[PDB]
Amino acid sequence: AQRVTYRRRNPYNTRSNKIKVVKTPGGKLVAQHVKKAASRVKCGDCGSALAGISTLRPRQYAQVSKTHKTVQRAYGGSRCANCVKERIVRAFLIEEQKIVKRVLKEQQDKEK
Amino acid sequence: GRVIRNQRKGAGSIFTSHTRLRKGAAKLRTLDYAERHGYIRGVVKQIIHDPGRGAPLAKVAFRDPYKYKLREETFIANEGVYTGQFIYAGKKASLNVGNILPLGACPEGTIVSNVEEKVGDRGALGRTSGNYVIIIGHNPDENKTRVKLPSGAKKIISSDARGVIGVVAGGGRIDKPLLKAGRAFHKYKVKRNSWPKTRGVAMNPVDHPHGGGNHQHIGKASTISRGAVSGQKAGLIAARRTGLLRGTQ
Amino acid sequence: GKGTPSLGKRHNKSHTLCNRCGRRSFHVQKKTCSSCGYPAAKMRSHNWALKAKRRRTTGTGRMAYLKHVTRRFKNGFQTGVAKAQT
Amino acid sequence: PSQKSFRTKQKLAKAQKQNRPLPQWIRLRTDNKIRYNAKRRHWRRTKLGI
RNA sequence: GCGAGAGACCGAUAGCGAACAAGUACAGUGAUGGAAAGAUGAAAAGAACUUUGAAAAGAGAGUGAAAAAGUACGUGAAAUUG
RNA sequence: AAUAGGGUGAAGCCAGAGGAAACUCUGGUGGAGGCUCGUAGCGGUUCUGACGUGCAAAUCGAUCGUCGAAUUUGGGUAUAGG
RNA sequence: UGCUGUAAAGCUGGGUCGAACGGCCUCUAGUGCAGAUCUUGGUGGUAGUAGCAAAUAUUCAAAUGAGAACUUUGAAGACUGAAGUGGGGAAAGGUUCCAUGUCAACAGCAGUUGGACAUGGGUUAGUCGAUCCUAAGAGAUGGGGAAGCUCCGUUUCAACGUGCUUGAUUUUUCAGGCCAACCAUCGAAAGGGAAUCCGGUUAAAAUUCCGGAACUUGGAUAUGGAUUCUUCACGGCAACGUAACUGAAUGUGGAGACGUCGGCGUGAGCCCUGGGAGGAGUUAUCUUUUCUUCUUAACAGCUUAUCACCCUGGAAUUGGUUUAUCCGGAGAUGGGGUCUUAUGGCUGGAAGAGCGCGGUAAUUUUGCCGCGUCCGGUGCGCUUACGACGGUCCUUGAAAAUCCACAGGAAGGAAUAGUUUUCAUGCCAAGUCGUACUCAUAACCGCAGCAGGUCUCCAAGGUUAACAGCCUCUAGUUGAUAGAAUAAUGUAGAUAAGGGAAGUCGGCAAAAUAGAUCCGUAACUUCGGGAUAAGGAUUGGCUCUAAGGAUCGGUUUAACGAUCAACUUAGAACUGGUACGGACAAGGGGAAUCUGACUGUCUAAUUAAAACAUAGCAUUG
RNA sequence: UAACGAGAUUCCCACUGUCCCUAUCUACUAUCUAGCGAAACCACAGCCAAGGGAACGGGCUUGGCAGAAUCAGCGGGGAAAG
RNA sequence: AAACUUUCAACAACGGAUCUCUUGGUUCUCGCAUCGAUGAAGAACGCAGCGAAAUGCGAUACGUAAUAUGAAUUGCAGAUAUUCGUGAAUCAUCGAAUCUUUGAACGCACAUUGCGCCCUCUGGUAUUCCGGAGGGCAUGCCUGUUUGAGCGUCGUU
Ligand SMILES: NC[C@@H]1O[C@H](O[C@H]2[C@@H](O)[C@H](O[C@@H]3[C@@H](O)[C@H](N)C[C@H](N)[C@H]3O[C@H]3O[C@H](CO)[C@@H](O)[C@H](O)[C@H]3N)O[C@@H]2CO)[C@H](N)[C@@H](O)[C@@H]1O
Ligand SMILES: NC[C@@H]1O[C@H](O[C@H]2[C@@H](O)[C@H](O[C@@H]3[C@@H](O)[C@H](N)C[C@H](N)[C@H]3O[C@H]3O[C@H](CO)[C@@H](O)[C@H](O)[C@H]3N)O[C@@H]2CO)[C@H](N)[C@@H](O)[C@@H]1O
Ligand SMILES: NC[C@@H]1O[C@H](O[C@H]2[C@@H](O)[C@H](O[C@@H]3[C@@H](O)[C@H](N)C[C@H](N)[C@H]3O[C@H]3O[C@H](CO)[C@@H](O)[C@H](O)[C@H]3N)O[C@@H]2CO)[C@H](N)[C@@H](O)[C@@H]1O
Ligand SMILES: [Mg+2]
Ligand SMILES: [Mg+2]
Ligand SMILES: [Mg+2]
Ligand SMILES: [Mg+2]
Ligand SMILES: [Mg+2]
Ligand SMILES: [Mg+2]
Ligand SMILES: [Mg+2]
Ligand SMILES: [Mg+2]
Ligand SMILES: [Mg+2]
Ligand SMILES: [Mg+2]
Ligand SMILES: [Mg+2]
Ligand SMILES: [Mg+2]
Ligand SMILES: [Mg+2]
Ligand SMILES: [Mg+2]
Ligand SMILES: [Mg+2]
Ligand SMILES: [Mg+2]
Ligand SMILES: [Mg+2]
Ligand SMILES: [Mg+2]
Ligand SMILES: [Mg+2]
Ligand SMILES: [Mg+2]
Ligand SMILES: [Mg+2]
Ligand SMILES: [Mg+2]
Ligand SMILES: [Mg+2]
Ligand SMILES: [Mg+2]
Ligand SMILES: [Mg+2]
Ligand SMILES: [Mg+2]
Ligand SMILES: [Mg+2]
Ligand SMILES: [Mg+2]
Ligand SMILES: [Mg+2]
Ligand SMILES: [Mg+2]
Ligand SMILES: [Mg+2]
Ligand SMILES: [Mg+2]
Ligand SMILES: [Mg+2]
Ligand SMILES: [Mg+2]
Ligand SMILES: [Mg+2]
Ligand SMILES: [Mg+2]
Ligand SMILES: [Mg+2]
Ligand SMILES: [Mg+2]
Ligand SMILES: [Mg+2]
Ligand SMILES: [Mg+2]
Ligand SMILES: [Mg+2]
Ligand SMILES: [Mg+2]
Ligand SMILES: [Mg+2]
Ligand SMILES: [Mg+2]
Ligand SMILES: [Mg+2]
Ligand SMILES: [Mg+2]
Ligand SMILES: [Mg+2]
Ligand SMILES: [Mg+2]
Ligand SMILES: [Mg+2]
Ligand SMILES: [Mg+2]
Ligand SMILES: [Mg+2]
Ligand SMILES: [Mg+2]
Ligand SMILES: [Mg+2]
Ligand SMILES: [Mg+2]
Ligand SMILES: [Mg+2]
Ligand SMILES: [Mg+2]
Ligand SMILES: [Mg+2]
Ligand SMILES: [Mg+2]
Ligand SMILES: [Mg+2]
Ligand SMILES: [Mg+2]
Ligand SMILES: [Mg+2]
Ligand SMILES: [Mg+2]
Ligand SMILES: [Mg+2]
Ligand SMILES: [Mg+2]
Ligand SMILES: [Mg+2]
Ligand SMILES: [Mg+2]
Ligand SMILES: [Mg+2]
Ligand SMILES: [Mg+2]
Ligand SMILES: [Mg+2]
Ligand SMILES: [Mg+2]
Ligand SMILES: [Mg+2]
Ligand SMILES: [Mg+2]
Ligand SMILES: [Mg+2]
Ligand SMILES: [Mg+2]
Ligand SMILES: [Mg+2]
Ligand SMILES: [Mg+2]
Ligand SMILES: [Mg+2]
Ligand SMILES: [Mg+2]
Ligand SMILES: [Mg+2]
Ligand SMILES: [Mg+2]
Ligand SMILES: [Mg+2]
Ligand SMILES: [Mg+2]
Ligand SMILES: [Mg+2]
Ligand SMILES: [Mg+2]
Ligand SMILES: [Mg+2]
Ligand SMILES: [Mg+2]
Ligand SMILES: [Mg+2]
Ligand SMILES: [Mg+2]
Ligand SMILES: [Mg+2]
Ligand SMILES: [Mg+2]
Ligand SMILES: [Mg+2]
Ligand SMILES: [Mg+2]
Ligand SMILES: [Mg+2]
Ligand SMILES: [Mg+2]
Ligand SMILES: [Mg+2]
Ligand SMILES: [Mg+2]
Ligand SMILES: [Mg+2]
Ligand SMILES: [Mg+2]
Ligand SMILES: [Mg+2]
Ligand SMILES: [Mg+2]
Ligand SMILES: [Mg+2]
Ligand SMILES: [Mg+2]
Ligand SMILES: [Mg+2]
Ligand SMILES: [Mg+2]
Ligand SMILES: [Mg+2]
Ligand SMILES: [Mg+2]
Ligand SMILES: [Mg+2]
Ligand SMILES: [Mg+2]
Ligand SMILES: [Mg+2]
Ligand SMILES: [Mg+2]
Ligand SMILES: [Mg+2]
Ligand SMILES: [Mg+2]
Ligand SMILES: [Mg+2]
Ligand SMILES: [Mg+2]
Ligand SMILES: [Mg+2]
Ligand SMILES: [Mg+2]
Ligand SMILES: [Mg+2]
Ligand SMILES: [Mg+2]
Ligand SMILES: [Mg+2]
Ligand SMILES: [Mg+2]
Ligand SMILES: [Mg+2]
Ligand SMILES: [Mg+2]
Ligand SMILES: [Mg+2]
Ligand SMILES: [Mg+2]
Ligand SMILES: [Mg+2]
Ligand SMILES: [Mg+2]
Ligand SMILES: [Mg+2]
Ligand SMILES: [Mg+2]
Ligand SMILES: [Mg+2]
Ligand SMILES: [Mg+2]
Ligand SMILES: [Mg+2]
Ligand SMILES: [Mg+2]
Ligand SMILES: [Mg+2]
Ligand SMILES: [Mg+2]
Ligand SMILES: [Mg+2]
Ligand SMILES: [Mg+2]
Ligand SMILES: [Mg+2]
Ligand SMILES: [Mg+2]
Ligand SMILES: [Mg+2]
Ligand SMILES: [Mg+2]
Ligand SMILES: [Mg+2]
Ligand SMILES: [Mg+2]
Ligand SMILES: [Mg+2]
Ligand SMILES: [Mg+2]
Ligand SMILES: [Mg+2]
Ligand SMILES: [Mg+2]
Ligand SMILES: [Mg+2]
Ligand SMILES: [Mg+2]
Ligand SMILES: [Mg+2]
Ligand SMILES: [Mg+2]
Ligand SMILES: [Mg+2]
Ligand SMILES: [Mg+2]
Ligand SMILES: [Mg+2]
Ligand SMILES: [Mg+2]
Ligand SMILES: [Mg+2]
Ligand SMILES: [Mg+2]
Ligand SMILES: [Mg+2]
Ligand SMILES: [Mg+2]
Ligand SMILES: [Mg+2]
Ligand SMILES: [Mg+2]
Ligand SMILES: [Mg+2]
Ligand SMILES: [Mg+2]
Ligand SMILES: [Mg+2]
Ligand SMILES: [Mg+2]
Ligand SMILES: [Mg+2]
Ligand SMILES: [Mg+2]
Ligand SMILES: [Mg+2]
Ligand SMILES: [Mg+2]
Ligand SMILES: [Mg+2]
Ligand SMILES: [Mg+2]
Ligand SMILES: [Mg+2]
Ligand SMILES: [Mg+2]
Ligand SMILES: [Mg+2]
Ligand SMILES: [Mg+2]
Ligand SMILES: [Mg+2]
Ligand SMILES: [Mg+2]
Ligand SMILES: [Mg+2]
Ligand SMILES: [Mg+2]
Ligand SMILES: [Mg+2]
Ligand SMILES: [Mg+2]
Ligand SMILES: [Mg+2]
Ligand SMILES: [Mg+2]
Ligand SMILES: [Mg+2]
Ligand SMILES: [Mg+2]
Ligand SMILES: [Mg+2]
Ligand SMILES: [Mg+2]
Ligand SMILES: [Mg+2]
Ligand SMILES: [Mg+2]
Ligand SMILES: [Mg+2]
Ligand SMILES: [Mg+2]
Ligand SMILES: [Mg+2]
Ligand SMILES: [Mg+2]
Ligand SMILES: [Mg+2]
Ligand SMILES: [Mg+2]
Ligand SMILES: [Mg+2]
Ligand SMILES: [Mg+2]
Ligand SMILES: [Mg+2]
Ligand SMILES: [Zn+2]
Ligand SMILES: [Zn+2]
């Protein structure tokens, strides 16, 4: 079987010197240098991979349209679906309870 | 003779602490207006391992009272603190596990950790895993408090000095044998270069005061004066007593 | 083991060329010339090494400016040009 | 090495140019005393100083 | 350092390390260390040409006052050698 | 950044059997360990072999220790003569 | 050649030579050599002696040449045997590269040959690296020490922006609005990091040149599309979709970005292989045979996925489910959906290329022409990438530059028109330095072409547990002075009757054992070991037998049919000069004493141990 | 003190040229040739016995004797070299 | 008797003593006072028709100008070089210039021919992006200018 060589001056098997082996139209077997695998965009609240957002190496996000980098919702490309739902319910109930703790202290400013 | 292992440490070339992997300095908040007069509320975001420390650290997020920005503090995690817990810090904070209170606001018998030696130094006493400080009593006329330290010493601190309610997490670590030398190697791999230790009696007289002889032996008393000089203080320095400790102290 | 086998592991230059004296005495890790003292303002020279002073002193290079002070001094440091005689 | 600095490559250029034999018309000058270039250098024999 | 005049000085293993492309060649990672090495002849007239040889060279020849001066160059001791 | 192929078979898990219970037993599964045989590697036990004006200012041959970690190692960097 | 003098010495005949020198009275001194393991230079005997013996190995012929064991070419015989004697690189060298000529010196013989000598030629980048970021660290500044060379300090007792952003203004003024926790710098050709591929081309360069096809960043900028009268889009219950589809200050997140193992799955490349279309080899005999071509880049579109998530729904007769035990009223099974596009497919790139054949043009630069280049299978395979999982730590396994999204709502926007360069298309530019070659039994370092040392990538067939050993394909070598003999003594390797450690300080050395299957396995023990304890049996070849599966197909007899497929285990008969792990590979074992618990570490170059370390114990501050 | 050990020691089984007691075989040397070609060492050198002598002579004294030039081995001596 | 060994002589070798020189050295005396931010000493790289070194020089590169002098230079070559003359050669002399990358070394940096910013002009549809040319941006300190800071502080509403 044909054997291959690195295509650059780096002779060491580092993370940035990964190669794949590809067969060319010349029937030869040559090394093609591959780039580092992208990591998934993750939720800032729960840490899970966000759905609907492309997985790219960071500079590549600048050269792609916005529909690939976001989701049509509040906090779209930043928080998860369940975490946005949980933020909304917590915001509503606590602020509703904020009225209760206020009115409960104005009724006791007349009877107590 | 030669410079002994005691003295080469002062230059601190290979004897500096290994701090690449450290997660931050464990400190209380800077004493500010909110802590001096009322209370401020923060939330525990992470409980993480700090290399070189037996105690886990907690990263707690507070809001900034003066500008729109979030401030992340690195506290020593007390046992029972959980992620998402609300931590209340200040003079008027309540006696709940994890809250940071001035010493005068805590009754006698309160178990507290990361106690300030001086008001606003952000923590000096009771910071290792399983350790804590017991509050012995108060002297309100002089604004002073008596506490018991992990060493068993009683200390008098300003009652305005702050501390964190509870015991430092991770206690009982010493209960397990290390077994292997490799376990100690990895323990000190992220602390400093202090392991392993060669016995001075096994070296030559140039290398150490205990070295030399046709048998391994110290030759003179290993209790060394407090007034001895550098290069002599190897052994039991200013030892009040020696031998097996029998009875109570 | 400490001789011929160990002498095979010499491929890391401790010194490289100096910009001041061009000698390859510039300690790479120390960033100093052991010969010329670069980047110190003064030149490295010792009175216990007089032969080193011989090797690098006034007159061992071109003296591209001190060459001509004697000839300009001898004429009293003239200003103007020589005038052709009638 | 293949990866070399400009400062290195310029010194190697001078070393090649200094590694010429004596031009032969120089021996014909009057009162000429140089018979050969006495500052010849082989790469394997004597190493430079870089 | 600059410009000069001198000597009961040394005479190329001497005299400065260096009379010469000498702080040169070369050694050492580096600080540093550091030589050897002057002389054909008045003048190249540095041997055209022929010949043997693959050639270097040799033999004739030629130049020269001298080749018992041929850039292994004045003179040419000893060790050592035919 | 690097480290063939085997042996052993720790926790955990599945099924079955015995027992009043407390529990015990059996067959699998699993893949632990500064465990083990053993390459590369790292080391250097014995022949007190070779050589000992050497291939070599420490090598060569066979034999041998260890070989998944207190592992091996490149490069950068720090520590400098009492 | 002689003479004189006791002598130190003086004179003289002959030869050589070529430019200065002597006698006498005195002065002066760096003034007399056989030694000093003297200094520098030169030269002997030794002596044509020791020796030029590791790395399996060479031979015939022709060509060239004066000359050929050694150069070139051809033929053969071999080796390295993918952990290479192969193909590249980092460090180091610096022209050793290539062509021509060439042998005085060097290549410890030789030399027509060379990494030698001489003359020339040769290294082409927006995309490969530098440059940029920060790492351990290094290190200026305000300062504080020190007589001083300098030391400390890196945001530090500091008034620390050569700040920006707009509307502009053409009044080259401004008007101002925001901020300035942290922010000198250097520091990686293996960390982080914008972007290139295929075919072809040279004597020597190529991800650099030629051809074609792409991509990024910075800049300019118009058209189409998109959007608005409900101004800053629509759709979907939802996960979310999109060709687009305002968003200041400030804030929050993500990527950058990260340990090591274990088994499983998938891909890619390699390995194996079936039809068909070609070429070569063997062919006394046999072989529908053996070997070989049948390939497809970056990039664009569509499609393609475990995990995860959404809708529906409400579970004991608990169910689902992995090789590995977890999940479910905090919503399982079931049904239906969403996403990441890693990876595969199709298509474009692209057959026009490349490849294999056949026919031709011709001293001929270089070709011209025709045919084919298709469809599959297989797997506890190897290497590697990825995924979902499980284990592990008194160990929990970088930073910064840089990019994006979100929160927020400043400000600005339409109706006869407005906005936006995150949709498509179009325009311009990408500088500087390195780039040849060696990477080692000859290009580095060991004084040298030294059996030493020196970091890393790719890796075929057979046997096999195996990347071991042995043999072989590709590639590369056939290099190591040679010829003739074959005493002693060696060095390296073999064998030996009977005895079997009597040898010796001592079994030193050698020998014996050895793979795999079944059986069997003692004291002691910290119950984990000891253990391969000990000790037995078997093993070839051939012909069979038996067991072990996959995919489809329907009233639960599918308990059956169809098709396809891999090597494992066990057993039987026969067979041979009783051999069979047949080469290779490959434990000797047992009973005790001393000692250190163990793994580990050290005297590089005479000591590896009982020495050091260790966990554990105890004491001190 | 189980386990571990290239640690020191004793015994047993197996195995053996360690030995009785040696013999035989192979390659490479040594050997001869062509080419090439060092080094250590060297007061002068090199036959013995006795004597005396710095009490262990190559030299001196007294005797034995003694015939050119040489090759492979060898390890008594040169109180050999280092 | 040869060979061999040793001695002697002649010639030839080896080697470089001896003799003789000497643009060098050494020492004494006499006389002079002149490095650099107007960028020194020193370093690297280059420069000639044909040069490697030494010497000299700096992209004006073995030199440009001027002055003096007055026909060379020379190893070869060669003038669109020169001769009763603004004219050959010459570190003879020297008063004008040139003087690469550096170096006390000065925009920051430097194991990099790495990275900025300002002014004028210029090219590419350009105040902003890309290219080119020329001129600038170091530190301590002094005198002065301008712009500022402090209830340190004076006067006044
Ligand atoms: N880094 C700041 C602090 O400096 C201090 O360190 C000490 C030093 O500054 C100085 O100590 C000297 C020291 O300079 C010197 N090189 C060694 C000497 N043993 C010390 O001495 C010290 O210890 C001795 C003990 O006998 C006491 O008697 C004495 O009071 C104390 N000064 O005095 C300080 C103590 O008074 C803190 N002790 C130290 O923990 C910390 O590092
Ligand atoms: N494993 C599932 C997927 O992979 C992720 O993790 C990937 C790796 O990060 C992970 O690697 C190992 C894993 O072997 C095993 N679970 C142990 C270890 N915790 C993991 O490692 C990880 O966690 C450690 C925490 O100590 C980090 O320090 C480390 O950087 C990270 N790689 O295993 C995965 C290999 O593909 C996440 N576990 C999960 O969220 C994701 O869905
Ligand atoms: N017997 C040895 C072994 O067992 C097998 O051999 C089997 C038989 O052939 C043998 O026995 C048979 C006997 O039954 C009948 N007479 C037939 C056969 N000739 C005999 O066997 C004899 O035959 C030849 C002689 O050299 C051998 O191969 C064989 O070992 C021997 N025993 O014994 C075995 C069982 O009965 C295999 N051939 C092989 O594994 C090996 O030979
Ligand atoms: Mg390459
Ligand atoms: Mg990288
Ligand atoms: Mg790519
Ligand atoms: Mg991730
Ligand atoms: Mg977080
Ligand atoms: Mg989307
Ligand atoms: Mg883009
Ligand atoms: Mg976008
Ligand atoms: Mg998308
Ligand atoms: Mg000392
Ligand atoms: Mg403190
Ligand atoms: Mg240590
Ligand atoms: Mg100790
Ligand atoms: Mg201890
Ligand atoms: Mg100890
Ligand atoms: Mg000792
Ligand atoms: Mg002492
Ligand atoms: Mg004492
Ligand atoms: Mg002692
Ligand atoms: Mg002891
Ligand atoms: Mg003791
Ligand atoms: Mg090294
Ligand atoms: Mg170094
Ligand atoms: Mg300086
Ligand atoms: Mg200068
Ligand atoms: Mg390299
Ligand atoms: Mg190169
Ligand atoms: Mg050459
Ligand atoms: Mg070399
Ligand atoms: Mg040097
Ligand atoms: Mg170099
Ligand atoms: Mg003078
Ligand atoms: Mg003078
Ligand atoms: Mg005078
Ligand atoms: Mg001399
Ligand atoms: Mg003399
Ligand atoms: Mg001298
Ligand atoms: Mg020296
Ligand atoms: Mg003469
Ligand atoms: Mg003469
Ligand atoms: Mg004459
Ligand atoms: Mg002649
Ligand atoms: Mg004549
Ligand atoms: Mg004469
Ligand atoms: Mg003569
Ligand atoms: Mg002569
Ligand atoms: Mg003589
Ligand atoms: Mg690998
Ligand atoms: Mg293994
Ligand atoms: Mg059960
Ligand atoms: Mg082990
Ligand atoms: Mg082992
Ligand atoms: Mg064992
Ligand atoms: Mg391996
Ligand atoms: Mg080895
Ligand atoms: Mg050895
Ligand atoms: Mg030996
Ligand atoms: Mg010997
Ligand atoms: Mg053997
Ligand atoms: Mg071994
Ligand atoms: Mg063994
Ligand atoms: Mg491990
Ligand atoms: Mg390391
Ligand atoms: Mg000293
Ligand atoms: Mg002393
Ligand atoms: Mg005469
Ligand atoms: Mg004369
Ligand atoms: Mg004298
Ligand atoms: Mg003498
Ligand atoms: Mg000598
Ligand atoms: Mg000799
Ligand atoms: Mg011989
Ligand atoms: Mg030999
Ligand atoms: Mg040969
Ligand atoms: Mg073979
Ligand atoms: Mg192999
Ligand atoms: Mg190789
Ligand atoms: Mg090659
Ligand atoms: Mg050349
Ligand atoms: Mg050639
Ligand atoms: Mg030769
Ligand atoms: Mg020829
Ligand atoms: Mg070649
Ligand atoms: Mg570029
Ligand atoms: Mg790049
Ligand atoms: Mg750049
Ligand atoms: Mg750039
Ligand atoms: Mg960047
Ligand atoms: Mg730092
Ligand atoms: Mg610096
Ligand atoms: Mg400093
Ligand atoms: Mg200062
Ligand atoms: Mg100061
Ligand atoms: Mg201050
Ligand atoms: Mg202005
Ligand atoms: Mg940098
Ligand atoms: Mg990098
Ligand atoms: Mg890199
Ligand atoms: Mg083409
Ligand atoms: Mg083509
Ligand atoms: Mg073409
Ligand atoms: Mg090439
Ligand atoms: Mg294109
Ligand atoms: Mg739309
Ligand atoms: Mg913003
Ligand atoms: Mg944030
Ligand atoms: Mg991150
Ligand atoms: Mg990693
Ligand atoms: Mg990283
Ligand atoms: Mg895995
Ligand atoms: Mg696979
Ligand atoms: Mg596959
Ligand atoms: Mg056949
Ligand atoms: Mg649905
Ligand atoms: Mg049911
Ligand atoms: Mg499994
Ligand atoms: Mg849940
Ligand atoms: Mg893809
Ligand atoms: Mg057709
Ligand atoms: Mg077909
Ligand atoms: Mg690999
Ligand atoms: Mg993985
Ligand atoms: Mg928004
Ligand atoms: Mg907000
Ligand atoms: Mg909003
Ligand atoms: Mg750029
Ligand atoms: Mg560069
Ligand atoms: Mg290349
Ligand atoms: Mg290589
Ligand atoms: Mg190799
Ligand atoms: Mg060789
Ligand atoms: Mg070698
Ligand atoms: Mg080679
Ligand atoms: Mg050397
Ligand atoms: Mg080697
Ligand atoms: Mg190696
Ligand atoms: Mg195999
Ligand atoms: Mg293997
Ligand atoms: Mg393999
Ligand atoms: Mg041969
Ligand atoms: Mg051989
Ligand atoms: Mg022979
Ligand atoms: Mg023999
Ligand atoms: Mg033998
Ligand atoms: Mg044999
Ligand atoms: Mg045999
Ligand atoms: Mg036999
Ligand atoms: Mg026998
Ligand atoms: Mg018999
Ligand atoms: Mg027998
Ligand atoms: Mg027996
Ligand atoms: Mg015995
Ligand atoms: Mg005995
Ligand atoms: Mg043995
Ligand atoms: Mg043996
Ligand atoms: Mg036997
Ligand atoms: Mg056997
Ligand atoms: Mg057994
Ligand atoms: Mg064997
Ligand atoms: Mg035994
Ligand atoms: Mg031990
Ligand atoms: Mg004990
Ligand atoms: Mg070590
Ligand atoms: Mg040793
Ligand atoms: Mg030693
Ligand atoms: Mg050992
Ligand atoms: Mg040893
Ligand atoms: Mg104990
Ligand atoms: Mg204590
Ligand atoms: Mg041992
Ligand atoms: Mg043992
Ligand atoms: Mg004993
Ligand atoms: Mg024998
Ligand atoms: Mg012999
Ligand atoms: Mg011979
Ligand atoms: Mg020879
Ligand atoms: Mg001798
Ligand atoms: Mg006799
Ligand atoms: Mg006597
Ligand atoms: Mg006598
Ligand atoms: Mg005698
Ligand atoms: Mg004698
Ligand atoms: Mg006598
Ligand atoms: Mg006699
Ligand atoms: Mg003897
Ligand atoms: Mg001798
Ligand atoms: Mg001579
Ligand atoms: Mg003389
Ligand atoms: Mg003089
Ligand atoms: Mg100029
Ligand atoms: Mg200059
Ligand atoms: Mg420079
Ligand atoms: Mg500049
Ligand atoms: Mg440049
Ligand atoms: Mg520069
Ligand atoms: Mg830069
Ligand atoms: Mg100034
Ligand atoms: Zn979330
Ligand atoms: Zn320098």
For residue A92, which amino acid is it?
F
Q: CA of C28, closest CA in chain D: separation in Å?
A: 13
Strand, coil or helix: A112: coil
Among positive and negative, which fits the CA dihedral C72, C76, C79, C81? Answer: negative
Strand, coil or helix: A45: coil
Strand, coil or helix: B17: coil
Contacts of C18 (CB under 8 A, 6+ apart): C24, C25, C26, C33, C35, C36, C38
Q: Which of B3, B226, B229 to mutate to test the pocket of ligand 1 (most atoms within 8 A of CB)?
A: B226
- Report the alpha-carbon distance of residue B117 to residue C8 in Å, rounded: 59
Strand, coil or helix: B244: coil
- Report the alpha-carbon distance of residue D27 to residue D35 in Å, rounded: 7
For residue A102, which amino acid is it?
R
D40-D41-D45 Cα angle (round to 5): 140
Chain discontinuities in chain B, listed by preceding residue (C to N exceeding 2.5 Å): none
C35 burial level (CB within 10 Å; 0-12, 13-18, 19+): buried
Strand, coil or helix: B20: coil
User: C61: which nucleotide lies closest, measuring CA to C1'?
Assistant: I42
Using a CB-CB cut-off of 8 Å, the residues of chain D touching C24 are: 49-50
Residues recorded for chain B? 249
- Chains C and D lie in contact, requiring 3 or more CB pairs less than 8 Å apart: yes
| Alpha-carbon distances of A92 from A82, A89, A96, B84, B190, rounded to whole Å | 15, 5, 6, 19, 47
The DSSP call for residue A33 is: E
| DSSP per-residue string spanning C35-54 | TT-TTSSSPP--TT-HHHHH
Pull the structure tokens for residue A23: 């067969």
User: B196: which nucleotide lies closest, measuring CA to C1'?
Assistant: G613
Residue written as tokens 């729960």? A46
Pull the structure tokens for residue B2: 């030669």
Pull the structure tokens for residue C5: 């086998």
| Alpha-carbon distances of A14 from A56, B224, B232, rounded to whole Å | 21, 55, 51
Distance in angstroms: CA B104, C1' I58: 84
A78's enclosing H/E stretch is: none
- Report the alpha-carbon distance of residue C69 to residue A58 in Å, rounded: 66
Cβ under 8 Å to C: D residues 1-50: 7, 11, 49-50
| DSSP per-residue string spanning B154-166 | EEEEETT-EEEES
Pull the structure tokens for residue D41: 């250098």
- Report the alpha-carbon distance of residue A19 to residue B193 in Å, rounded: 40
CB B128 within 8 A of CB B136: no
Pull the structure tokens for residue A77: 């490309």
Cis peptide before C39 (omega within 30 of 0): yes
Pull the structure tokens for residue B132: 């804590």
CB B128 within 8 A of CB B169: no
Pull the structure tokens for residue B25: 């300095």
Among positive and negative, which fits the CA dihedral A100, A103, A109, A112? Answer: negative
Question: Whose CA is closest to B105, among B140, B65, B67, B152?
Answer: B140
Pull the structure tokens for residue A28: 């030869």
- Report the alpha-carbon distance of residue B46 to residue B21 in Å, rounded: 16
Using a CB-CB cut-off of 8 Å, the residues of chain C touching D11 are: 17
Question: Whose CA is closest to A38, among A27, A49, A30, A23?
Answer: A49
CB B147 within 8 A of CB B102: no
> Is the Cβ atom of B226 under 6 angstroms away from ligand 1?
yes
CA A65 to chain centre: 16
Q: What are the CB-based long-range contacts (under 8 Å, 24+) for B170-173?
A: B170/B54, B170/B55, B170/B56, B170/B79, B170/B129, B170/B130, B171/B79, B171/B129, B171/B130, B171/B131, B172/B129, B172/B130, B173/B54, B173/B129, B173/B130
- Report the alpha-carbon distance of residue C79 to residue D11 in Å, rounded: 42
Question: Whose CA is closest to B60, among B49, B50, B45, B70?
Answer: B45
Alpha helices (H) along B22-95: 33-37
Distance in angstroms: CA B212, C1' F18: 69
A97's enclosing H/E stretch is: helix A81-111
The DSSP call for residue B30 is: P
Question: Whose CA is closest to A79, among A42, A39, A40?
Answer: A42
> Is the Cβ atom of B241 under 6 angstroms away from ligand 1?
no
CB B200 within 8 A of CB B166: no
Give per-residue burial for B64-85: e unless 16+ CB within 10 Å, then b. Answer: eeeeeeeeebbbbbbbebeeeb
Residue written as tokens 């020279």? C45
- Report the alpha-carbon distance of residue B200 to residue B5 in Å, rounded: 9
- Report the alpha-carbon distance of residue B64 to residue B66 in Å, rounded: 6
Using a CB-CB cut-off of 8 Å, the residues of chain D touching C16 are: 50
Among positive and negative, which fits the CA dihedral C79, C84, C85, C86? Answer: negative
Please check if B191 is assigned to a binding site: no
How large is the greatest C-alpha to C-alpha distance in chain B, in angstroms? 74
D5 touches strand G (CB under 7 A): yes
Q: Which atom of ligand 1 is nearest to the CA of B10?
A: 16
Please check if C68 is assigned to a binding site: no
CA A1 to chain centre: 41
Alpha helices (H) along chain D: 6-17
- Report the alpha-carbon distance of residue B73 to residue B92 in Å, rounded: 20
- Chains D and B lie in contact, requiring 3 or more CB pairs less than 8 Å apart: no
Contacts of B198 (CB under 8 A, 6+ apart): B5
- Report the alpha-carbon distance of residue B162 to residue B158 in Å, rounded: 9
CB B103 within 8 A of CB B159: yes
Contacts of B158 (CB under 8 A, 6+ apart): B103, B118, B119, B143, B144, B145
Please check if B171 is assigned to a binding site: no
Contact D7 C24 (CB under 8 A): no
| Experimental technique behind these coordinates | X-ray
